Amino acid sequence: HRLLTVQAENALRAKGFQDGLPYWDWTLPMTALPEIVAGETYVNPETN
Amino acid sequence: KDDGKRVACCVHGMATFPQWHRLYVVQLEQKLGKKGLADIGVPYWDWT
């Protein structure tokens, strides 16, 4: 699984990225799933 | 044309030729980059 994550990072690096993959933290209690993934359609004001 | 003769906008034979053309190429550079590609600019083809 470490190799899998490393390969994913190396693959995504060449697509306009700076840092590594963020990690979820499900160890710490939460009340809702992450809003980064919850949404279906998001409004980008870059294209308005 | 300044006299309304419908002339071109290309600058050739005036001192501002290299400056205008470099502004043109950087325009296309930014137009390409804003579409989502942020790795390399337009290459230069050497002929010397």
DSSP 8-state class, residue A45: T
| Tokens, residue A12 | 């995504």
Amino acid (1-letter code) at residue A21:
L
Distance CA A46, CA A30 (A): 31
Cross-chain Cβ contact B37/A14 below 8 Å: no
Q: In this structure, are residues A22 and A37 in contact, taking their beta carbons and an 8 Å threshold?
A: no
Number of H helices, E strands in chain B: 1, 0
Question: Resolution in angstroms for this experimental structure?
Answer: 4.4
DSSP character string of A1-42: -HHHHHHHHHHHHTTT--S-------SS--SS--HHHH-S--
Instruction: List, as own/partner pairs, every contact residues A1-8 make where C-beta atoms lie below 8 angstroms and the sequence separation is at least 24, other chains included.
Output: none
Size of interface A-B (CB pairs under 8 A): 5
In 3D, which of B39, B42, B30 has the Cα closest to residue A15? Answer: B39
Q: What's the residue count for chain B?
A: 48
Residue that has been written with the tokens 């906008």 in this structure: B9
DSSP character string of B1-48: -TTS--------SSTTHHHHHHHHHHHHHHHHHTTT--S---------
DSSP 8-state class, residue A46: T
Minimum CA–CA partner of A16 in chain B = B38
DSSP 8-state class, residue B34: T
Determination method here?
cryo-EM
B35 CA: distance to closest CA in chain A (Å) = 10
